[PDB]
Amino acid sequence: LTKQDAVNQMMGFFQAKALTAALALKLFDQLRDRDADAAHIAARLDCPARSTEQLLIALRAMGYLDQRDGLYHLPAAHRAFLLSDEPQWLGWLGRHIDTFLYPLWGELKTAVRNDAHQRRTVFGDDRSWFDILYQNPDDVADFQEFLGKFAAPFIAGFVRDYDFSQHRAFLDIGSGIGSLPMAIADAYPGIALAICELPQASAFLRDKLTLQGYGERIDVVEGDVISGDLPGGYDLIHLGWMLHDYAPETQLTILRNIYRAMPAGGRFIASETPLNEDKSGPEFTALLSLNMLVSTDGGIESSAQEYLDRFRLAGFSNARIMKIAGPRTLIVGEK
Amino acid sequence: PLTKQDAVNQMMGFFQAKALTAALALKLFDQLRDRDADAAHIAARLDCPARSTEQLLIALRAMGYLDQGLYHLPAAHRAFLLSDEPQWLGWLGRHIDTFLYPLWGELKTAVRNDAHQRRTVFGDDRSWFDILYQNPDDVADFQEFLGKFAAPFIAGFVRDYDFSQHRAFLDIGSGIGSLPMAIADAYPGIALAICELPQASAFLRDKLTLQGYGERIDVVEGDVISGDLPIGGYDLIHLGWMLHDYAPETQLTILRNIYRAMPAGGRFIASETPLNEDKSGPEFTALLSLNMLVSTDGGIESSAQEYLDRFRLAGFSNARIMKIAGPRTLIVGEK
Numbered sequence: 270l271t272k273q274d275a276v277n278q279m280m281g282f283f284q285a286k287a288l289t290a291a292l293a294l295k296l297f298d299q300l301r302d303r304d305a306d307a308a309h310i311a312a313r314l315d316c317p318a319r320s321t322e323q324l325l326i327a328l329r330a331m332g333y334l335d336q337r338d339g340l341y342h343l344p345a346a347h348r349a350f351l352l353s354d355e356p357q358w359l360g361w362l363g364r365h366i367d368t369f370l371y372p373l374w375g376e377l378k379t380a381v382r383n384d385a386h387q388r389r390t391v392f393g394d395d396r397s398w399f400d401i402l403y404q405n406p407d408d409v410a411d412f413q414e415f416l417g418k419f420a421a422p423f424i425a426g427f428v429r430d431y432d433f434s435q436h437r438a439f440l441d442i443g444s445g446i447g448s449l450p451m452a453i454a455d456a457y458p459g460i461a462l463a464i465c466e467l468p469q470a471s472a473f474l475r476d477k478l479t480l481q482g483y484g485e486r487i488d489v490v491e492g493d494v495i496s497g498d499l500p501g502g503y504d505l506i507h508l509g510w511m512l513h514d515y516a517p518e519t520q521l522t523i524l525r526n527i528y529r530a531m532p533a534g535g536r537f538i539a540s541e542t543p544l545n546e547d548k549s550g551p552e553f554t555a556l557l558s559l560n561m562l563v564s565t566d567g568g569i570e571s572s573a574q575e576y577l578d579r580f581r582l583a584g585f586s587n588a589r590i591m592k593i594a595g596p597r598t599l600i601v602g603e604k
Numbered sequence: 605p606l607t608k609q610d611a612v613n614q615m616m617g618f619f620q621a622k623a624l625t626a627a628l629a630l631k632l633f634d635q636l637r638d639r640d641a642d643a644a645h646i647a648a649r650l651d652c653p654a655r656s657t658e659q660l661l662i663a664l665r666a667m668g669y670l671d672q673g674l675y676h677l678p679a680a681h682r683a684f685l686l687s688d689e690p691q692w693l694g695w696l697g698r699h700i701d702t703f704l705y706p707l708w709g710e711l712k713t714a715v716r717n718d719a720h721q722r723r724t725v726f727g728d729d730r731s732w733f734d735i736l737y738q739n740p741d742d743v744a745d746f747q748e749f750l751g752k753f754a755a756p757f758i759a760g761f762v763r764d765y766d767f768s769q770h771r772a773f774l775d776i777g778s779g780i781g782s783l784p785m786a787i788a789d790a791y792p793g794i795a796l797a798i799c800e801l802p803q804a805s806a807f808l809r810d811k812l813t814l815q816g817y818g819e820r821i822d823v824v825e826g827d828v829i830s831g832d833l834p835i836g837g838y839d840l841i842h843l844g845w846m847l848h849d850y851a852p853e854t855q856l857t858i859l860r861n862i863y864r865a866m867p868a869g870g871r872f873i874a875s876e877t878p879l880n881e882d883k884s885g886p887e888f889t890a891l892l893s894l895n896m897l898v899s900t901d902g903g904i905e906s907s908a909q910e911y912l913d914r915f916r917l918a919g920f921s922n923a924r925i926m927k928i929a930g931p932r933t934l935i936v937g938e939k
């Protein structure tokens with residue numbers, strides 16, 4: 270890398286806020302059905318023309334908008350993630366960044382010096398990460414909606430590559446938006462499906478499963494996997510993308526509680542995005558681990574071997590890495 | 605054109621940004637100036653906990669800043685990652701951590717109001733430069749990092765422009781003064797002076813005296829907006845990267861005062877980084893305009909024709925563009 274690469278990356282928060290500010294203004298929706306110049310976009314946004322134009326010029330220069338003779342145009346290929354009404358809209362992630370992650374990363378240096386999250390220094394809030402994240406129903410929605418889209422390729426692969434038919438009942442601990450049990454329901458009518466979630470997420474999840482027609486099919490159980498509050502004859506239990514939100518010590522407490530609640534002969538699968546064997550990457554995972562530092566209660570990313578050892582210390586038999594292609598690593602053990 | 609994954613990557617780009625500024629502010633790379641060290645050793649040198657130190661080191665390794673296990677600082681990177689080397693990016697990092705990153709947090713409201721966010725982010729309704737220069741350490745931070753930015757422009761300006769044309773030279777807003785210093789090394793007879801704001805002037809006197817130019821470059825406090833400018837035989841006057849820190853209307857005042865101040869037959873040169881002809885790029889310049897929006901008193905980037913119009917309206921004769929080596933466009937006016 271060059272000196273210029275470093276300067277670009279050091280100032281990469283410029284691009285990041287240009288996009289989140291535009292999404293929050295719903296700037297791109299001003300171009301859903303028409304092309305417009307800056308003066309017209311500003312007037313409809315009820316924003317001064319000069320500063321609206323400054324943002325529009327930046328978004329064109331970044332390549333998200335086209336501009337011909339002062340007329341801005343939204344590329345057809347960008348509509349799916351820039352428009353509010355679209356399934357891949359990034360506005361959910363945008364708000365999560367604006368509300369939580371960008372403020373907390375502002376204090377990264379201190380998080381590293383103390384190995385401590387920055388929720389109190391940044392927010393003046395001593396509550397737990399998920400209590401802070403979940404204080405408003407809209408913040409629960411943003412978080413679960415953007416994670417759900419991120420999880421879609423994993424879920425599709427899991428359902429296509431693992432034989433869920435061999436189990437009678439399946440519990441998804443920390444399912445989030447519930448798109449895994451939903452996909453399992455679409456594929457296997459016979460298996461019982463349940464979710465165990467924290468209270469605020471249970472409430473969002475109940476309303477969403479009900480609206481989408483799964484209210485009779487997927488049982489929602491409030492609980493806490495760290496305190497031991499869990500339902501239950503589940504011969505398959507899954508934990509997706511939750512271990513990394515907690516310190517390794519807590520991950521052992523979570524895994525021991527799950528083991529204890531399992532039925533005999535039960536199977537357990539955790540899915541994570543681990544660091545590579547020599548903990549040299551991948552880059553987004555390495556940076557995610559820093560995100561867990563500043564925001565969560567002890568979270569960190571780990572290697573596959575580290576999850577494997579944790580399964581064995583927690584009491585699981587035949588702990589192993591599932592031989593399954595996809596964006597996650599699946600760690601599996603039995604009771 | 606761009607994909608959802610590209611947009612996500614750029615929305616999360618504050619990850620890489622803060623990873624680098626945190627690493628610089630912790631002096632992390634300095635612990636690899638002499639030796640290759642593991643995380644636990646680097647962490648003891650830094651007095652940070654090994655866990656979070658390793659988390660940062662893995663991120664830096666995956667971003668390609670470090671090799672590794674023992675971490676190794678690539679030779680090509682020493683120049684800008686080591687704190688006592690002449691291209692150190694640590695000055696930039698402190699300016700980002702103290703001023704730019706927090707103010708970009710409020711970009712949306714800046715755009716909605718066409719107004720800097722100094723008051724809302726800092727609880728301080730003084731001037732940009734008064735807030736920026738509140739503390740001589742932030743003066744040094746600002747002036748030093750800008751100095752590194754200007755070094756290719758300065759080499760090209762001293763290269764492709766003939767300063768022997770001129771008996772005396774006045775640099776308004778010279779900042780760290782490295783342009784007069786370069787003119788001094790190359791043109792032993794020309795009189796050299798600087799007009800700066802009071803706090804920049806205090807830093808400048810110290811910095812020029814330390815470097816051995818204290819008897820060679822006159823430092824004179826003043827205010828180009830108010831018209832408080834020195835008078836000598838300044839047959840060349842320069843204004844480097846200052847117009848874009850103020851509103852067009854205010855640039856008019858600055859240029860009008862400069863014209864009133866120059867001797868007959870004199871030449872004035874403003875050096876800017878203009879937006880292109882249809883104001884659609886380049887990307888860094890377009891985002892710098894937003895940076896000026898969130899921080900300065902009305903600042904914005906402009907096209908070259910926009911600067912030409914201002915030179916003409918302020919009364920300059922023979923207003924023209926000069927193309928030179930380096931990242932800056934020179935706008936020339938005469939009396």
Ligand SMILES: Nc1ncnc2c1ncn2[C@@H]1O[C@H](CSCC[C@H](N)C(=O)O)[C@@H](O)[C@H]1O
Pocket residue numbers: 399416417420442443444445446465466467470492493494495496508509510511514
């Ligand atoms: N102590 C706890 N008990 C139960 N659920 C918890 C928990 N701590 C966090 N969670 C839940 O774990 C989820 C992690 S986000 C992961 C979502 C989903 N499983 C996926 O694979 O994409 C969140 O929804 C959060 O509410």
Ligand SMILES: Nc1ncnc2c1ncn2[C@@H]1O[C@H](CSCC[C@H](N)C(=O)O)[C@@H](O)[C@H]1O
Pocket residue numbers: 733750751754776777778779780799800801804826827828829830843844845846849
């Ligand atoms: N009203 C004013 N009168 C004189 N100098 C001013 C001024 N307002 C801002 N400045 C100065 O303008 C400079 C802008 S930063 C530009 C630094 C340098 N000329 C370069 O080319 O890189 C700052 O040093 C600031 O102190």
